Short mmCIF file of C-alpha atoms and ligand atoms in Angstrom, two decimals:
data_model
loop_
_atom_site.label_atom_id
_atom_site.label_comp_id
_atom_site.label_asym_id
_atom_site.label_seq_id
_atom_site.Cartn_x
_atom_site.Cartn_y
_atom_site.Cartn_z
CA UNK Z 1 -9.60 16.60 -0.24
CA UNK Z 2 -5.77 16.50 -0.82
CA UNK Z 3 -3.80 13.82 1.29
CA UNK Z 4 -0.16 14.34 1.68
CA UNK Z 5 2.15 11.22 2.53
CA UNK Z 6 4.20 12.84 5.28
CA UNK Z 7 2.47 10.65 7.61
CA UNK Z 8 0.57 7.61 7.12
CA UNK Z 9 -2.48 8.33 5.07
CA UNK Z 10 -5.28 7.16 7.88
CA UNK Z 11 -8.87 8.21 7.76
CA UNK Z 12 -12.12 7.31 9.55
CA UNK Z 13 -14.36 4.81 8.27
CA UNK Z 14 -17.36 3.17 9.76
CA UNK Z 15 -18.40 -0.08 9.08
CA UNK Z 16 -22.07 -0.47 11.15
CA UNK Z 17 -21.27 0.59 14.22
CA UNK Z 18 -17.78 0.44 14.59
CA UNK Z 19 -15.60 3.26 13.33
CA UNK Z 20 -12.51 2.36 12.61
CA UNK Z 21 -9.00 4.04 11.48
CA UNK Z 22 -7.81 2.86 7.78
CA UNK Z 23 -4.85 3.61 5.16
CA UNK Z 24 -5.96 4.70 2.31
CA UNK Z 25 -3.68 1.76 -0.02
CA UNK Z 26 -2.50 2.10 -3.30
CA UNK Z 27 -0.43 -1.24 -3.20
CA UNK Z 28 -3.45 -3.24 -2.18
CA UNK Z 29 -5.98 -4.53 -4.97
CA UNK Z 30 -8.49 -5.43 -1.67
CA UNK Z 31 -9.61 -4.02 1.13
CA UNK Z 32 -8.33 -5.94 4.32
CA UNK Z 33 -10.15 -5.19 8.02
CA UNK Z 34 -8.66 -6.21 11.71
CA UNK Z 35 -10.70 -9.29 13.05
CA UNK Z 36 -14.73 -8.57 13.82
CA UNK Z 37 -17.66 -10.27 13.44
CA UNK Z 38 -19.60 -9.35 10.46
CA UNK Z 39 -22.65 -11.10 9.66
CA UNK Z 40 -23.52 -12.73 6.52
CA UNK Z 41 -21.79 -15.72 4.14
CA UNK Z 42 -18.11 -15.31 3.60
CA UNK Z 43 -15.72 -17.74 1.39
CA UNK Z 44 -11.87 -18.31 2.75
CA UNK Z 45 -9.05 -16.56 1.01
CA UNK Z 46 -5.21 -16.44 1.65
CA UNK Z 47 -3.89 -13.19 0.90
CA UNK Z 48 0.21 -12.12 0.66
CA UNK Z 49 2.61 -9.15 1.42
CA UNK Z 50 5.82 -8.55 2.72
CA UNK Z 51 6.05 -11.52 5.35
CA UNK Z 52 4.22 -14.06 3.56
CA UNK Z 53 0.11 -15.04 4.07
CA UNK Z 54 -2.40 -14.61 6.32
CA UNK Z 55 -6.11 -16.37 6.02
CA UNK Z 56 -8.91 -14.07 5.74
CA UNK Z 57 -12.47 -13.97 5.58
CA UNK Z 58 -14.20 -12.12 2.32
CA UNK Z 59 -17.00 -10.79 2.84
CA UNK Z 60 -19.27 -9.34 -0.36
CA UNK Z 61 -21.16 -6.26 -1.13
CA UNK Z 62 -20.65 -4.91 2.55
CA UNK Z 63 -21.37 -0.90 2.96
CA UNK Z 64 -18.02 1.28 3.61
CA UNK Z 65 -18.43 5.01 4.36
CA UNK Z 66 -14.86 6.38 4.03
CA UNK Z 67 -14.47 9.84 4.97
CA UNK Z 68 -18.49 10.44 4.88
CA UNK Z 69 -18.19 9.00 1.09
CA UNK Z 70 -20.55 5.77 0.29
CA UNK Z 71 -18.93 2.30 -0.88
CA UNK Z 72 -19.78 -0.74 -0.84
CA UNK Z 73 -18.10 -4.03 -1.87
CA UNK Z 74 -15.36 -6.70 -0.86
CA UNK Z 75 -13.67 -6.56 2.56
CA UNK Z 76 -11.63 -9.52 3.87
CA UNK Z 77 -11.32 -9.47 7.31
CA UNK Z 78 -8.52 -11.41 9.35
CA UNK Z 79 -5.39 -10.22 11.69
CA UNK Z 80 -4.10 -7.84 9.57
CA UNK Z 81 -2.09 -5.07 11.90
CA UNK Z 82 -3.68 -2.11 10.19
CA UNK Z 83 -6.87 -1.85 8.53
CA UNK Z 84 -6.09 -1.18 4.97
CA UNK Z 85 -8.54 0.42 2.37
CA UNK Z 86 -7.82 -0.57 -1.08
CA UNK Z 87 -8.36 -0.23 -4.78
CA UNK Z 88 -11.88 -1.69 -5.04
CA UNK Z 89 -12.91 0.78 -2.29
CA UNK Z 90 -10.68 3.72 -3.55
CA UNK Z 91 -12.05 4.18 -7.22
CA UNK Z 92 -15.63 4.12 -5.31
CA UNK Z 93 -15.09 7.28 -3.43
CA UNK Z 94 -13.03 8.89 -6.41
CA UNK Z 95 -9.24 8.64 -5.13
CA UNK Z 96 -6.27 9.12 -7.80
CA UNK Z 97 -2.91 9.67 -7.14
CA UNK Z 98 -1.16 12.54 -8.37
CA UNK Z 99 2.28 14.10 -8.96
CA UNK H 1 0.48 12.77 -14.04
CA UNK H 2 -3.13 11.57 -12.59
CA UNK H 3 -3.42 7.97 -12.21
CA UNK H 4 -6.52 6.45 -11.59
CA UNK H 5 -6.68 3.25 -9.51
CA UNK H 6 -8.81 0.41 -11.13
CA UNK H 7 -5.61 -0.79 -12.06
CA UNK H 8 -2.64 -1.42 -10.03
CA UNK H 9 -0.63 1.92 -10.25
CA UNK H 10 2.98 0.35 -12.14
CA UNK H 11 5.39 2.72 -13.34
CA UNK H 12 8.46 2.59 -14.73
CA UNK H 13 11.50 3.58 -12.42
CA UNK H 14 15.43 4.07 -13.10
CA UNK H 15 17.51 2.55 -10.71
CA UNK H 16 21.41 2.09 -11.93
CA UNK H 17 20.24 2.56 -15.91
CA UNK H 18 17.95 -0.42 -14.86
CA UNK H 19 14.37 0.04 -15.43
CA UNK H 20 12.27 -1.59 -13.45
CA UNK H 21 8.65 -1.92 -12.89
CA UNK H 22 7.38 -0.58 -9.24
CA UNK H 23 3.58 -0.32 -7.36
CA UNK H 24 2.86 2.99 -6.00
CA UNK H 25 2.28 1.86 -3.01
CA UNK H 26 0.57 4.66 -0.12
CA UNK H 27 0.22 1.72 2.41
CA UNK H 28 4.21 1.03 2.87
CA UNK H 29 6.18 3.49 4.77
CA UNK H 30 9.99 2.26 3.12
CA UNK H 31 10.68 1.21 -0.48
CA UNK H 32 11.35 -2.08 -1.06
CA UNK H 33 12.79 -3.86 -4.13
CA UNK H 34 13.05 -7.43 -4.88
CA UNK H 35 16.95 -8.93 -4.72
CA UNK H 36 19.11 -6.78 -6.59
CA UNK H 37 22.86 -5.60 -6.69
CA UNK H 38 23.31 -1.78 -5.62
CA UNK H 39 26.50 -0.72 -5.01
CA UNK H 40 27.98 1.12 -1.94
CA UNK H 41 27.29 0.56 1.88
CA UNK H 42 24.39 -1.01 3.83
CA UNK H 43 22.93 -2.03 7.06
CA UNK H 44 21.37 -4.92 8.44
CA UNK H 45 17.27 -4.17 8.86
CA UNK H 46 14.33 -5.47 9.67
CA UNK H 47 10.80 -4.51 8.40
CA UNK H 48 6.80 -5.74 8.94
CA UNK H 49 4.14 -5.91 6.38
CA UNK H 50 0.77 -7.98 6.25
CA UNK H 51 2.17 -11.52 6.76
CA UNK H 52 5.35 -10.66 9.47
CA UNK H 53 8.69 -9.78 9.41
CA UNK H 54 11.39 -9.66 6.33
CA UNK H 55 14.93 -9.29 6.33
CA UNK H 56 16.06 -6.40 3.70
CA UNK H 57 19.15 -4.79 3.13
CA UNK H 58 19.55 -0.63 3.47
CA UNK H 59 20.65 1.50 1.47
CA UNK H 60 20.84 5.12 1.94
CA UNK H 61 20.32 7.97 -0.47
CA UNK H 62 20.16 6.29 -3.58
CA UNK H 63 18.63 8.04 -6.76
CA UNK H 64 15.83 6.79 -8.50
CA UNK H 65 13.61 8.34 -11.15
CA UNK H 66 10.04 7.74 -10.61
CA UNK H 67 7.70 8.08 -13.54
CA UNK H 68 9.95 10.77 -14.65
CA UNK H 69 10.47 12.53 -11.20
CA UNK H 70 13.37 12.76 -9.31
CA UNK H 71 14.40 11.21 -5.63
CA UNK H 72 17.30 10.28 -3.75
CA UNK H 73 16.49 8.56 -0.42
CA UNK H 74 16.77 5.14 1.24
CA UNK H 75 16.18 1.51 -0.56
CA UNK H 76 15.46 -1.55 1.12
CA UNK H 77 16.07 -4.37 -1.08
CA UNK H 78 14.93 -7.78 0.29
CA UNK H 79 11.88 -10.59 -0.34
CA UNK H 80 9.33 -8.24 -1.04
CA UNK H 81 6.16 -9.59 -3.20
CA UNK H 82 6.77 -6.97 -5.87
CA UNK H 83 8.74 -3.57 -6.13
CA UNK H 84 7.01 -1.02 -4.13
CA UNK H 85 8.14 3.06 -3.77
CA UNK H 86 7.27 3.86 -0.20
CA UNK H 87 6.03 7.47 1.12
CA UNK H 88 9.64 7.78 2.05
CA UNK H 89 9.71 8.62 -2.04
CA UNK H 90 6.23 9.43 -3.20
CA UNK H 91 6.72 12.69 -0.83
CA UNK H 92 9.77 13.39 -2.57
CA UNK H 93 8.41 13.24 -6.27
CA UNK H 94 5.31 15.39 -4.75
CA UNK H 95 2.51 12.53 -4.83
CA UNK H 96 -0.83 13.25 -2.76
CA UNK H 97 -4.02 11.46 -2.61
CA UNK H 98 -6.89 13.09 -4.20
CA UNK H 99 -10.80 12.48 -3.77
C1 LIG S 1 -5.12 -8.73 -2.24
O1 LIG S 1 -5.24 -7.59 -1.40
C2 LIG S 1 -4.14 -7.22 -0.65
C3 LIG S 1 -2.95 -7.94 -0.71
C4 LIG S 1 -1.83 -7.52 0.03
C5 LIG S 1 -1.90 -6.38 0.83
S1 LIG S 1 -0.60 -5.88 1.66
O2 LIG S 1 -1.01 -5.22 2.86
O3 LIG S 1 0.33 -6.97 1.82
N1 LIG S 1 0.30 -4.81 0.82
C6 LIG S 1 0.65 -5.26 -0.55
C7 LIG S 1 2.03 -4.75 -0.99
C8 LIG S 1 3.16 -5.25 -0.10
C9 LIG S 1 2.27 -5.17 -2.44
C10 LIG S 1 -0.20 -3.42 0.88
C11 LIG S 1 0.91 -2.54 1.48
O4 LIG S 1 0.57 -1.15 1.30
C12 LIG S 1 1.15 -2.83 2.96
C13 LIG S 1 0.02 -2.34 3.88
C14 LIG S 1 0.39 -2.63 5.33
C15 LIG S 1 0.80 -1.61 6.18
C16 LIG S 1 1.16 -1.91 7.49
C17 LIG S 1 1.11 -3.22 7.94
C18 LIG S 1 0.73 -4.24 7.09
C19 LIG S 1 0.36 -3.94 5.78
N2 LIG S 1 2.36 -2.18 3.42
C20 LIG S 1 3.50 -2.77 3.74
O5 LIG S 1 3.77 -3.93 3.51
C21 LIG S 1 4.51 -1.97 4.50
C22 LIG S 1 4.08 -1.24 5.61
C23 LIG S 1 5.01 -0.48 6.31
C24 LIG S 1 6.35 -0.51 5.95
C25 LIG S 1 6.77 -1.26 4.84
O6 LIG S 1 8.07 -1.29 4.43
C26 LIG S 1 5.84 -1.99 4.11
C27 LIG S 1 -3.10 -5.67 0.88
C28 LIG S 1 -4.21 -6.08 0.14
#
């Protein structure tokens, strides 16, 4: 598919049996998730944007489906407003920008 | 172009006969450039991003070239992490998401 930017680029992805709305992120090298409880190890991690920090969890080789397309990888989880898919996720399911 | 995204997508932009280096950035609604002098008005604003709230400075239709393309639209310029064009821009030049 072709995503415009008029609006904010959301889409539906499940993670287990949660479906959740995400932006598809160009600006982010990782994917970030709103708080849940995951199972497995995880390893701490600060990440930054436009208001400083937050701590996150990061979570490893954790299956994505995006838009009914299969990834699997890193996803940090912590209180990030929005649940953000990004670039490690992105080249998975074949998504290039394009003007 | 088509850019791919297992790197971060930089381009170069022209903004005053400055060229700068900016993230193409689907995630952020505004563009927002790290402290800089443009000339004219502004207002007082106040934006979110992962880690809170930022104070930037706004200014309004201001022309930058993108990677080539043209836009004229609004500039925040303030304590972001890096340069970012907004989809306040990337509609402008014509950029969609593509899987
Ligand atoms: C290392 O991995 C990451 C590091 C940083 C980020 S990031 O999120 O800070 N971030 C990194 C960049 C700042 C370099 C990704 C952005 O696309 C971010 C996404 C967004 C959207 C809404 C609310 C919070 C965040 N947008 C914004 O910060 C944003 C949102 C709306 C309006 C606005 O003016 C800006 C993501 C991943």
């Amino acid at each position: 598919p072709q995503i415009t930017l008029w609006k904010r680029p959301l889409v539906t992805i499940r993670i287990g049996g949660q479906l959740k709305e995400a932006l598809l992120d160009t600006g982010a090298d990782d994917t970030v998730l709103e708080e849940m409880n995951l199972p497995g190890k995880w390893k701490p991690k600060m990440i930054g944007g436009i208001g400083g920090f937050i701590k996150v969890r990061q979570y490893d080789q954790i299956p994505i489906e995006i838009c009914g397309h299969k990834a699997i990888g890193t996803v940090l989880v912590g209180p990030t407003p929005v649940n953000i898919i990004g670039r490690n996720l992105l080249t998975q399911i074949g998504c290039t920008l394009n003007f």
